[PDB]
Amino acid sequence: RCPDCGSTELVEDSHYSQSQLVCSDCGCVVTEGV
């Protein structure tokens, strides 16, 4: 779940060679860096 809005729309979207699991509703970066 997202820590800010509590939504479960956590998508793994790599933005310019940066792996990042981010919420799809409010855009809160859950996890980043691998």
Binding site: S14, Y16, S17, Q18, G33, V34
Partner: protein, 1105 residues
């Protein structure tokens, strides 16, 4: 009265290319290996038997390699084309079978066809399916007719075995040591052992050093041990010159100091200096003198043979060596290693022969071990080798040695690397030039700068200009256009003719005759063949007999007057070059012979047989007189050069008018043409490689060399002719840059295609589960596949014809996690790419292991832009600095606007007059509809193209009246317009563009990864740190090397000075003195590694105040 000149003489070159030339070397070597050498290797190990249970044996009768086949079908073979092997990622090999006879239970059982291995078949060889085929049959097999071939196909990749270069064996080398002592060395190499024995003069006396002796011993003791005991005979053998005796005096005095005067005493002294090879198995039983005699007879000077413990030949050999050392100790006539007359070239044939011999010996040893282990204790069921003849041994050995490229022969103790290399498919010229490459034994790791020089011995044999620019400059070379590598001969008739020609036996006379001024020593492959008087008659008779045909045309004979030695070379690997024989100021080749050759009456073999053209070796041409042209022929001329432009190689042949340019320009042009973009072959569409570059509209050059016509480069061009105007425009072409026309690029100029391969495998594991591809995960909201799975077809595999974007799946691969219900996790093949790609084809194949191989060929159509590297076939590499519109381009009276504007300032510093000559010739040719020739040391002259220009109404110097497109006013100076053959290089700004966000880090050291494919970041090297220190920017250096790279926060205990975790010290079992601290992660790793090394760093922290 000028000497008549044969105009059609150059016609001798193509005929030579009909049977020999560029690619025939490796083909002939592989054919000789698979047809003759393999049978000899099998005969050498025809019988193998075990010591236990005698009267049992395994006898080989005859071995066959057969035609290439594939083991895909269940226990059935099938003919397979090389393109199919490329597609299926398998090897192109043929089953090595052999017929044998053995004894199972003392009853002879014979097998007529029993496979034992798989030999990878070289393309276009004798057994290859591609030979003897027509271009239509090549099209039926999906193979380019212009493909050079000669390369192996293993697991789908193309490997080429480079020609190895090494020093000649069994030759005395007189060289200076580190301390300046001029000593000698001889690496006697036989089929079994190679031993390098040296001789030094460290203390005015000659000591002989070998790896089998504990300490170097005086040479006089070895003389006394080898049969000759009288000192007078030794001195006579060394020489009768006063200075020779004066130099050898100390050795005689040192020998007389000891009590060594007989053969037994010397042998005992030698045996005292002999150390056992770490407790050799078996009772010695007083072998000291016997070991010494065996080392003298067999180990020392292996190439010099002793009939029956008769060291007369070995004594004469070491006496000649001592005499050479004495003579070299005066005038500094030190032999040089870079002299290519002492070089030997090993092709793929000899390497494959050694490898097959080693593998067969290992197989025989394994079979003997299995026999010894099975036969004496198993059962009354008689053991047979057929149940234990593993067929994967030789196959796996060959495959690994060809693919990995590292060769480890324990029987010969040879540990080589980089023998095989991946064939470069950048262009046809790239592969054609890489096929004729030659690596050096130096195996570059350091700055030798002694073989890297261009020696004059490379004349006619190796290309002087063609060399990789960089760290491999000078050690990686290319063969010339007209060259040949000799093979081994029988050496029988050579000895017979030498004995019949008056060569006195060395055993019949003492060594004093060796000191006579008129007596010349005759050698044979490093062995003393004998002595002779009036060596001119001997050399003339030997050359005439070789011309007649009774002696092989590749047997070389040379004379060294300084050492007075007649060398007769018949070993393989020597470089030879054809030359026209000149007798009494007139060449043997006339116009009538060339007319007959043109009409087809005769071939090059007829020229060889009729004593018209003969092969000369480097050592032989050292003594011969060669004339470049007919007008250069004088009274003292023995041979005539066929064609001077044959000096250059294949890559150098593309250079138009290379003699008008600078040598670094030619080298850079060869290096860039090896990377030139263009068509590969007629089967480039069905071909699927990991990276391919193609040109949209390739055009053949207007100024083409005869080498281009010979190599058929005009059928597969790698560039385009553009109307280049040499002028300065807008200041965007300051240093090597060029300005491109927007309208030209819009109409297809420079348009390129990049094909990439994406391969995936669905393999069956040990458990009965397989990788399966799921369908497109349709979105229930819209009843359509998601954006990621949009391009996938119904079977989960992307269909050709659509465009692929970044982070999109091509194959929806899911693999099981077990190896009760199977659990599949998704590992889809995502497409990493900055720009979009189009799928051209998807190939699905099935191997014998039920693994499905899927290959997608992605295509990208790219237009020239800012950053693309362009070449001009003259080493004038450039980058597109600006793309101006058509109206901004200057225009002539006819209305022609230039496509490429290049800077003139690049001409004076580089002196590329050849570029101007090529431009003028191309302009004349496009005006009169002709193709001018830029042949080296020839070609169309400037006067002819000037007349062609003045005839068509244009200026005789290329400079034309041009009006400026911007201001509309004429220019004060005329502009040099003309068509130039520009070639685009693979170096693109799109592939080289890189930008790094935070991104991933490495597990060991938390720093950005190395490469761009790994999404790495740029490294601040040591010199950058030095520059930042010199600038004094402490905060910038701290932010770069600590904050932005490997920043971390550790916990250090202020009591013990050790590293804690989560604000707690396990060492002191307390947390009051633990404090946080910023630190590079590499520094913490170093501290932990030092603590592991018992070097404990204790950190005493303190307040920042």
């Amino acid at each position: 009265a000028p000497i008549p000149t044969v105009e059609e003489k150059w016609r001798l070159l193509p005929a030579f290319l009909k049977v020999k030339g560029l690619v025939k070397q490796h083909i002939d070597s592989f054919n000789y290996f698979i047809n003759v050498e393999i049978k000899k290797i099998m005969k050498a190990n025809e019988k193998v038997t075990s010591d236990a249970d005698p009267m049992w044996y395994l006898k080989y009768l005859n071995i066959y390699v057969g035609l290439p086949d594939v083991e895909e079908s269940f226990n059935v073979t099938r003919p397979v084309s090389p393109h199919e092997c490329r597609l299926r990622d398998m090897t192109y090999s043929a089953p090595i079978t052999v017929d044998i006879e053995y004894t199972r239970g003392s009853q002879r059982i014979i097998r007529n066809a029993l496979p034992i291995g798989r030999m990878p078949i070289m393309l276009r060889s004798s057994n290859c399916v591609l030979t003897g085929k027509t271009p239509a049959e090549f099209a039926k097999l999906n193979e380019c007719p212009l493909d050079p071939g000669g390369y192996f196909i293993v697991k789908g990749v193309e490997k080429v075995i480079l020609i190895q270069e090494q020093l000649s064996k069994n030759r005395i080398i007189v060289e200076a040591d580190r301390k300046g002592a001029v000593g000698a060395s001889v690496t006697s190499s036989t089929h079994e052992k190679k031993s390098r024995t040296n001789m030094a003069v460290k203390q005015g006396r000659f000591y002989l050093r070998h790896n089998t002796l504990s300490e170097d011993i005086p040479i006089v003791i070895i003389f006394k041990a080898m049969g000759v005991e009288s000192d007078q005979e030794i001195v006579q053998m060394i020489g009768t010159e006063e200075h020779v005796m004066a130099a050898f005096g100390p050795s005689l005095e040192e020998c007389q100091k000891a009590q060594i005067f007989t053969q037994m005493q010397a042998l005992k002294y030698i045996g005292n200096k002999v150390r056992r090879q770490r407790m050799w198995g078996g009772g010695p039983k007083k072998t000291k003198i016997e070991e010494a005699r065996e080392l003298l007879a067999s180990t020392i000077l292996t190439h010099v043979p002793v009939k029956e413990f008769n060291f007369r030949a070995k004594c004469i050999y070491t006496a000649v060596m001592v005499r050479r050392v004495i003579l070299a100790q005066g005038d500094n006539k030190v032999d040089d290693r870079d002299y290519y007359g002492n070089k030997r070239l090993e092709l793929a044939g000899q390497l494959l022969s050694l490898l097959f011999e080693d593998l067969f010996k290992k197989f025989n040893s394994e079979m003997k071990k299995i026999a010894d282990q099975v036969i004496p204790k198993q059962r009354a069921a008689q053991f047979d080798v057929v149940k234990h003849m593993r067929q994967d041994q030789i196959t796996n050995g060959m495959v690994n040695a060809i693919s990995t490229g590292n060769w480890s022969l324990k029987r010969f103790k040879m540990d080589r690397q980089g023998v095989t290399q991946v064939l470069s498919r950048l262009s046809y010229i790239s592969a054609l030039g890489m096929m004729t490459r030659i690596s050096s034994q130096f195996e570059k790791t350091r700055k030798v700068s002694g073989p890297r020089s261009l020696q004059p011995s490379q004349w006619g044999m190796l290309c002087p200009s063609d060399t990789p620019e960089g760290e491999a400059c000078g050690l990686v070379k290319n063969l010339a256009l007209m060259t040949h590598i000799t093979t081994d001969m029988e050496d029988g008739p050579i000895v017979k003719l030498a004995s019949n020609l008056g060569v006195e036996d060395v055993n019949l006379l003492c060594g004093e005759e060796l000191s006579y001024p008129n007596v010349f020593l005759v050698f044979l492959n490093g062995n003393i063949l004998g002595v002779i008087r009036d060596h001119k008659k001997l050399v003339n008779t030997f050359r005439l007999m070789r011309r007649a045909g009774y002696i092989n045309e590749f047997v070389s004979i040379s004379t060294n007057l300084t050492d007075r030695c007649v060398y007769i070379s018949s070993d393989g690997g020597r470089l030879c070059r054809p030359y026209i024989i000149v007798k009494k100021q007139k060449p043997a080749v006339t116009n009538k012979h060339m007319e007959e050759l043109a009409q087809g009456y005769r071939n090059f073999e007829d020229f060889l047989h009729e004593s018209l053209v003969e092969y000369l070796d480097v050592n032989e041409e050292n003594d011969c007189n060669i004339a470049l042209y007919e007008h250069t022929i004088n009274k003292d001329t023995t041979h005539l050069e066929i064609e001077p432009f044959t000096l250059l190689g294949v890559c150098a042949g593309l250079i138009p008018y290379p003699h008008h340019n600078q040598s670094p320009r030619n080298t850079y042009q060869c290096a860039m043409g090896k990377q030139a973009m263009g068509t590969i072959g007629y089967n480039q569409r069905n071909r699927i490689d990991t990276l391919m570059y193609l040109l949209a509209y390739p055009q053949k050059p207007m100024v083409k060399t005869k080498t281009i016509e010979l190599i058929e480069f005009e059928k597969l061009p790698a560039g385009q002719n553009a109307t280049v105007a040499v002028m300065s425009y807008s200041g965007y072409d300051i240093e090597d840059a060029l300005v491109l026309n927007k309208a030209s690029l819009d109409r297809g100029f420079g348009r390129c295609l990049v094909y990439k391969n994406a391969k995936c495998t669905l393999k069956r594991y040990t458990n009965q589960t397989f990788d399966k591809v799921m369908g497109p995960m349709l979105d229930a909201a819209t009843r359509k596949p998601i954006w990621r799975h949009e391009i996938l077809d119904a079977d989960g595999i992307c269909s050709p014809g659509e465009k692929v974007e970044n982070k999109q799946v091509l194959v929806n691969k899911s693999m099981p996690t077990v190896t009760q219900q199977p659990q599949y996790k998704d590992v889809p093949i995502t497409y990493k790419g900055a720009t979009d790609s189009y799928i051209e084809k998807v190939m699905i194949s099935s191997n014998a292991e039920d693994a499905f191989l899927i290959k997608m060929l992605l295509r990208q159509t790219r237009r020239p832009e800012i950053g693309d590297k362009f070449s001009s076939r003259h080493g004038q590499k450039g980058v597109c600095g600006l793309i101006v519109p058509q109206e901004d381009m200057p225009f002539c009276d006819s209305g022609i606007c230039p496509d490429i504007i290049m800077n003139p300032h690049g001409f004076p510093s580089r002196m590329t007059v050849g570029k101007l000559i090529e431009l003028l010739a191309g302009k004349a040719g496009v005006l009169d509809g002709r193709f001018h020739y830029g042949t080296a040391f020839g070609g169309s002259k400037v006067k002819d193209v000037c007349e062609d220009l003045v005839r068509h109404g244009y200026n005789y110097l290329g400079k034309d009246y041009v009006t400026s497109g911007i201001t509309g006013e004429p220019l004060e100076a005329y502009i040099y317009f003309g068509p130039v053959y520009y070639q685009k290089l693979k170096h693109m700004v799109l592939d080289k563009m890189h930008a790094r966000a935070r991104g991933p880090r490495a597990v060991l050291t938390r720093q950005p990864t190395e490469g761009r494919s790994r999404d790495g970041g740029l490294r601040l090297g040591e010199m950058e740190r030095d520059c930042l220190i010199g600038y004094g920017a402490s905060m910038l250096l701290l932010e770069r090397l600590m904050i932005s790279s490997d920043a971390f926060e550790v916990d250090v205990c202020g009591q013990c000075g050790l590293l804690g975790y989560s604000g707690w010290c396990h060492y002191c079992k307390s947390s009051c003195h633990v404090s946080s601290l910023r630190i590079p992660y590499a520094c913490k790793l170093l501290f932990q590694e030092l603590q592991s090394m018992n070097i404990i760093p204790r950190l005493k922290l303190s307040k920042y105040n």
